[PDB]
From a paper:
To elucidate the structural basis of binding and neutralization of influenza virus by the PMD-based peptides, crystal structures of the neutralizing (template-based CP1 and CP8) and non-neutralizing (non-template based CP14) peptides in complex with H1/PR8 and H5/Viet HAs were determined at 1.59–2.87 Å resolution, respectively. All peptides recognize the hydrophobic surface and embedded cavities at the interface of HA1-HA2 in the HA stem region. This region is highly conserved in HAs across influenza A groups 1 and 2 and influenza B viruses, and the target of HA stem broadly neutralizing antibodies (bnAbs), including sdAb3854.
Finally, direct head-to-tail cyclization was attempted. Crystal structures of peptides carrying the templates D-proline- L-proline (CP1), cysteine-cysteine (CP8) and the peptide without template (CP14), in complex with H1/PR8 HA were compared. Peptides (CP1, CP8 and CP14) all mimic the binding mode of sdAb38 by occupying the same hydrophobic groove in the HA1/HA2 interface on HA, and bury on average ~148/440 Å2 surface on HA1/HA2 respectively, which is comparable to the surface area buried by sdAb38 (~141/675 Å2).
Author numbering:
A (entry chain B), B (entry chain B), C (entry chain B): 1 to 60, 67 to 171
D (entry chain A), E (entry chain A), F (entry chain A): 11 to 54, 54A, 55 to 83, 83A, 84 to 95, 95A, 96 to 125, 125A, ...
G (entry chain G), H (entry chain G), I (entry chain G): 1 to 13
Amino acid sequence: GLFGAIAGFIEGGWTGMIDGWYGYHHQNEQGSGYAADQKSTQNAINGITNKVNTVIEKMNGKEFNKLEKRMENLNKKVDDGFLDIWTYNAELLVLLENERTLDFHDSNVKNLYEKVKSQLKNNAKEIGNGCFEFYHKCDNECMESVRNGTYDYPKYSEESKLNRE
Amino acid sequence: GLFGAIAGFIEGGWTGMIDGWYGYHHQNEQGSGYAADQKSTQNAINGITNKVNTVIEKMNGKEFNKLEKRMENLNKKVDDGFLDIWTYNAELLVLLENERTLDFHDSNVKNLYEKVKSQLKNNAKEIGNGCFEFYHKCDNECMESVRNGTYDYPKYSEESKLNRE
Amino acid sequence: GLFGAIAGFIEGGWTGMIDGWYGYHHQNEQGSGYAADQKSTQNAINGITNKVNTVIEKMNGKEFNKLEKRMENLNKKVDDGFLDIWTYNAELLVLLENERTLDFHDSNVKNLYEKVKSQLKNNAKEIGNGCFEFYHKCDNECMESVRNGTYDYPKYSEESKLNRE
Amino acid sequence: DTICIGYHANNSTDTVDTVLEKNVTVTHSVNLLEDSHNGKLCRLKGIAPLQLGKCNIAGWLLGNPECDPLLPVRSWSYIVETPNSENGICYPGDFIDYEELREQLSSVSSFERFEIFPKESSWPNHNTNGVTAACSHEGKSSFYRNLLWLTEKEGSYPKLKNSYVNKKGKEVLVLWGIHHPPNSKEQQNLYQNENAYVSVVTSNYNRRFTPEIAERPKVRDQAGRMNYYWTLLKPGDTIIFEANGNLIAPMYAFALSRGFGSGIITSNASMHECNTKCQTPLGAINSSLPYQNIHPVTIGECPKYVRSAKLRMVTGLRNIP
Amino acid sequence: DTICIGYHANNSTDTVDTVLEKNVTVTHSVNLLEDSHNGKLCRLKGIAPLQLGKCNIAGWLLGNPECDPLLPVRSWSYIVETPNSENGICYPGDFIDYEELREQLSSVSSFERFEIFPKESSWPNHNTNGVTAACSHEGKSSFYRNLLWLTEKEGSYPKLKNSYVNKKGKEVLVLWGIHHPPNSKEQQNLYQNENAYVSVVTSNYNRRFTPEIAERPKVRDQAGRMNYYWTLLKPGDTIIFEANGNLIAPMYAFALSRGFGSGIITSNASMHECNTKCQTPLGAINSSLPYQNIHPVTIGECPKYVRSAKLRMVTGLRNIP
Amino acid sequence: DTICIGYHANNSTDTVDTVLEKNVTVTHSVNLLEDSHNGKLCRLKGIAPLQLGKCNIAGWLLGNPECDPLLPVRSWSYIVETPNSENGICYPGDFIDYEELREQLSSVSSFERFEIFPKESSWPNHNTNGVTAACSHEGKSSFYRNLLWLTEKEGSYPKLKNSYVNKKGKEVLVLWGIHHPPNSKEQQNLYQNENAYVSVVTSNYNRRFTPEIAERPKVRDQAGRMNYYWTLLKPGDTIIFEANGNLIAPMYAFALSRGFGSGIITSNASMHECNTKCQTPLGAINSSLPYQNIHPVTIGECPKYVRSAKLRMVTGLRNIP
Amino acid sequence: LYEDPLGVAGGMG
Amino acid sequence: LYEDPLGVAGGMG
Amino acid sequence: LYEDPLGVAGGMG
Ligand SMILES: *[C@@H]1O[C@H](CO)[C@@H](O[C@@H]2O[C@H](CO)[C@@H](O)[C@H](O)[C@H]2NC(C)=O)[C@H](O)[C@H]1NC(C)=O
Ligand SMILES: *[C@@H]1O[C@H](CO)[C@@H](O[C@@H]2O[C@H](CO)[C@@H](O)[C@H](O)[C@H]2NC(C)=O)[C@H](O)[C@H]1NC(C)=O
Ligand SMILES: *[C@@H]1O[C@H](CO)[C@@H](O[C@@H]2O[C@H](CO)[C@@H](O)[C@H](O)[C@H]2NC(C)=O)[C@H](O)[C@H]1NC(C)=O
Ligand SMILES: *[C@@H]1O[C@H](CO)[C@@H](O)[C@H](O)[C@H]1NC(C)=O
Ligand SMILES: *[C@@H]1O[C@H](CO)[C@@H](O)[C@H](O)[C@H]1NC(C)=O
Ligand SMILES: *[C@@H]1O[C@H](CO)[C@@H](O)[C@H](O)[C@H]1NC(C)=O
Ligand SMILES: *[C@@H]1O[C@H](CO)[C@@H](O)[C@H](O)[C@H]1NC(C)=O
Ligand SMILES: *[C@@H]1O[C@H](CO)[C@@H](O)[C@H](O)[C@H]1NC(C)=O
Ligand SMILES: *[C@@H]1O[C@H](CO)[C@@H](O)[C@H](O)[C@H]1NC(C)=O
Ligand SMILES: *[C@@H]1O[C@H](CO)[C@@H](O)[C@H](O)[C@H]1NC(C)=O
Ligand SMILES: *[C@@H]1O[C@H](CO)[C@@H](O)[C@H](O)[C@H]1NC(C)=O
Ligand SMILES: *[C@@H]1O[C@H](CO)[C@@H](O)[C@H](O)[C@H]1NC(C)=O
């Protein structure tokens, strides 16, 4: 997409992640797991709910005798013109909104990736597909430290330096 | 925002920076200071002035006797339909323009950050919050060299290499 | 632009690249050359063709005697209102579509740059202007390995490590 | 030891169109275009419609006897004519300003059918028994239930002049008709004065009619015709009829109340015990989504009609499993 | 030694709505929706309006004597009726094609009131002194200032026929009236011929009137009525009046000029010494912003009317101090 | 050893406007606004227009003899009047409901001009040779080709009554006229009965005319005038004329067919051997682009008319060489 | 478990 | 040589 | 001190 993440350097989605729109997969000693990012998912749900809402609420028979053909045709012109305008507006709005929403999701997940990367610094290496391989042992507490945004870089700085050589 | 800078990895703004929309804060030996980026601010002011202008300039009583009810109702239908269309158009345009403008500002400041980062290379470390800590001494001349886009990397390459070890 | 590449950290275009919208320039032992990126160019052509198509297909005389002035003026009001709405819609659509298309191209080329960069890792250095200088010898086979997305990092890891010291 | 960023995917086959791409499969979407109706004619904000059956508006108002009579007081939320209502103007003639009257009743919510001039006490020294085969009911010749054919009695048509004063607190719609025999001899044998005249007056209405005698092509085998006229007597005003022939006197009139949101639709759907906020000539609509491609004719709080076949807004992600 | 990227923040409380978010505080914004008016009726491109005071259009044109007379030549930028102008058609009757005449004057910028047929030389052998209590001025019975009641003199109503030729270089609006007495006896005592007739002709206008005598409910205690007619005599054309009774002759007519941008508004605001490019029935508007939610009725260069309560375009940044 | 990312640039000078920037040079663009026409009147879906030359609609229909007669059967895709067609209503009078007739013919695709009442067998004991200088052809006084002036013969005007039955399977448009002499003496010398009357009847049409005699300002040096009326006799219906004076009888009528997509335009462009899907009063348009700023009046499949001078959609990149 | 009144995310926590 | 039915890219391969 | 004819940036240099 416009931000390179979805259908980009992260080739596909995760049907195993049932708990959120964006999130993480970890594998360490204690095993593997998915884990949704609830704050970003909730903020995206807020924004998209608002988008749907404002689109929903932005939108809120005569006869003629034989000698009133001009008025009949003017009435039909009015009805047809309003119909044209509203069909055009609805289809246009939907197209542009769908584009913006897909790009919104792309941007959200790229932002997630960048937050993790700038948290980790050289304590891990980017191995593509949106994954970092740690230069140190990272247990479930360390994984949650990355998730909640509280990763301690100097805590593992020296060990990751050693294994990175 | 859509580009991760404003309300993102740069958590808040600078009320101390009164001279521009985007800019820099420095602290070295000779002291601290804010300094607006006038070229990016002026280009953004150009674009936003143009946006406001084109929105401003994209936009540039009958009676009926008792036996003309059909024509009265057609006139009222016409007035109401045009009113609906124009209210819809104004509100839609404002919403989408505001979204695009906030994202424009976000993109501008992220671009600023990336220009500084690709100028500095490993002569400094990213310490989050949109800041770089230099691996060498950077005086006011060096700070302006970063601001005007003329940072000399080989000039401090070896000193920053040493302190970076 | 919105993504910092076009008219940004890649200052200008390539009139020497006649074979695609985006692509590469290489210089190694065996000489120099341009080379379009055909997959990204074809995908962009697909998207822009679709945009043009949907804009093309979203769009698909009375008289009055002296005593019918009210109906004449209502007919003229109808014609003028529809004219206003459609002029407004056409100009608005064109403006926003042009903005989105320029940003689309900007995003595509920035994505290209990032794919190359995350393929290369520290086997090369970013020297600005959207170019990487390799820390190893990269022949035409290596250049195509970068283009087709099959760059072998461990193949030149040690040589680039040595020259990078 | 690795950590990875990713995004949701599921087994959804929902597809939405964008500007750059068309069949984009997405994890979740919401539809904005209602395309389903129940095929029934249903109540509107708790009020049943008024169905005219075999009659159109003209036949019901004039009182064509072929139509099952309606209760004296009725109140509806919308009027339904059926496509080919055989019964209407049964004696040939033109319904003057008929379309304007349709438009008037498009905002009427109530009628009380009341006797304005009783048959036996309003037109003395005139005969009130005229009938015709053009408006037959039960095989034999009849006449409109709301009008009265005033003819000569014992060879003389005295000048009649009667009056009504509106003490109903509402508009009262009054209808009448003027006869045009095909030949003068008929006008003689029916009203005895060749140069007859009718005059109908209120405070803001004023018209004078004179029979126009001309042989006309026989419609429903009638070479003479019968024009129909109407007016809205405001509360407190008086209507005055004065004639010496050719007048088809009013007998029953209507006391009208005005409401909001109603209209007239043609529909061959049937009334069911149901309730909607949105009625179309095809059926009811849930007025929850902003658009509908069912019918441009709607009554009630209703989505905007568009021509589109699909309006779907993506909320989820691009589905890549 | 550090350097930092950042963005502007201030103490602004301006908020704008986006697609994804509603109360977004921003550093700077511009308003596009004008919602303020001055409550005054003001000049339009330097031209004062025409105020009719106690009269409506009909009363002013016909010359109802209860209304403070206006100077012989007047020119305005828009006409103002006030909501409940007591004075209008003071002798009962219908103003034929009145709405069309309102529409005509909606593009008139000038009038010269001039005598077209002087009272003392245009209708000899007829009496020009008729008055009525329905149009009383200063307690006593009077008549329209621009028309003249032609009655019988010394028991005879000779056939009159007069003419006017338009040598004003402009359209001249001519008005007249035809009387309808309640009983024949009055028509006898007023014009002496029961079968009277009036004829008014130009090159493109042609009408013939015959008095319709019928007892009508007395409005302003008049059982007879008086219809009013008008026409626009083009430059160079001739208007011809011919009658033998029932004619309410024209005395004063109007020479009209056509302009651009005018109209008729109902307003109970008062004229002040002020100037605007945009007038509404509530007051003046600065025509600088593209939208306004003040009034759908505007005159002059004016923003487009919308229903919105807030249209605000952000120019600054998201305000995060 | 280096590799570089870049983008296309060329020598294009195409510029497009965006929201944030105006003169943006781009590598490629497509135009959406057609602004070119060929200046010719051309066929529409293979069907030539109908050109009236010196006549307008009224002159052609009535049969003004100054206009080059057209073949008996004609079929067109649109009608072209030319700006100042000198020939029209040549004997003065008003064309009643003329605009409605224009609107009717705005959906007509065919006419057969056929004799409905032959000159020599339809009105016996009346004279069919009346002419006038107001409608002169070749210097001498003449009359409409499609009507017939019925006058007195040998001092007597017997009551005539004729009929036509529509056996053409299509609507037949019938026109006629009623004369209004300036003085009674002329009505005497022309039709011998001062109180003459005409009656025209169908199954749904009905009108009675009586000559209105009044001295009128002489137009084309005629103090009397001549009104023109028309009607559409449906297939199978009968039209009946009955008169004793003042009738301008129909001689030729038109059998009409209805089509889609036609209209009436005023244009002083000339017919060429060419073909378009889109005609404007200035010339033809290629109906390939969605918009056009040529003319708001279009006939055929045509782009939407807008006021813009430039609508250009960028497809390439920002051109930076 | 998100506050999703319109079901934008189809249940999902 | 791209599939460019509208000539969006002006020939170009 | 920017060229800001509409006051888009509220003075500000
Ligand atoms: C809409 O997009 C879907 C997603 O690819 C298309 O569905 C597949 O189409 C291919 C080729 O026709 C089939 O082989 C697959 O079996 C389809 N998958 C499913 C789940 O149906 C679909 O063809 C697209 N439709 C249009 C009109 O483009
Ligand atoms: C608009 O946004 C502002 C910014 O937060 C809101 O203002 C604050 O609201 C909180 C809670 O109501 C108060 O405690 C603060 O004192 C408010 N600050 C100011 C400066 O007023 C405001 O409530 C929002 N309004 C709406 C309708 O959402
Ligand atoms: C449209 O943009 C073009 C691109 O810069 C402008 O063309 C140049 O304008 C400068 C100054 O007027 C000249 O010195 C150059 O010779 C022009 N180049 C070409 C190729 O013409 C042009 O002026 C812009 N037009 C508007 C109205 O802004
Ligand atoms: C992570 O964040 C949560 C919530 O902010 C906090 O309770 C916890 O202590 C943090 N650290 C770890 C290791 O979970
Ligand atoms: C920075 O840029 C300015 C303006 O381009 C220039 O005058 C100056 O010499 C440059 N270098 C420093 C150190 O200021
Ligand atoms: C590059 O990709 C192409 C096409 O996918 C493939 O044929 C080729 O073997 C790859 N490697 C090189 C060195 O070209
Ligand atoms: C899709 O997944 C849901 C689980 O959320 C399941 O109930 C449903 O049966 C699945 N449908 C298909 C076609 O796989
Ligand atoms: C009457 O109902 C039938 C039943 O489907 C339908 O086919 C027909 O179109 C309807 N007629 C009208 C006039 O709606
Ligand atoms: C906001 O800041 C301005 C300085 O630009 C000051 O004049 C004003 O008083 C301040 N207002 C508040 C409410 O702090
Ligand atoms: C007349 O002015 C008063 C003063 O506020 C106002 O309340 C009233 O609505 C006005 N009437 C009309 C008809 O505008
Ligand atoms: C632009 O380039 C094309 C080659 O694609 C060439 O044919 C043309 O002459 C050039 N025009 C100018 C003005 O340089
Ligand atoms: C007639 O054609 C001429 C030739 O250019 C043109 O100037 C004129 O405007 C045309 N007249 C009309 C009424 O179109």
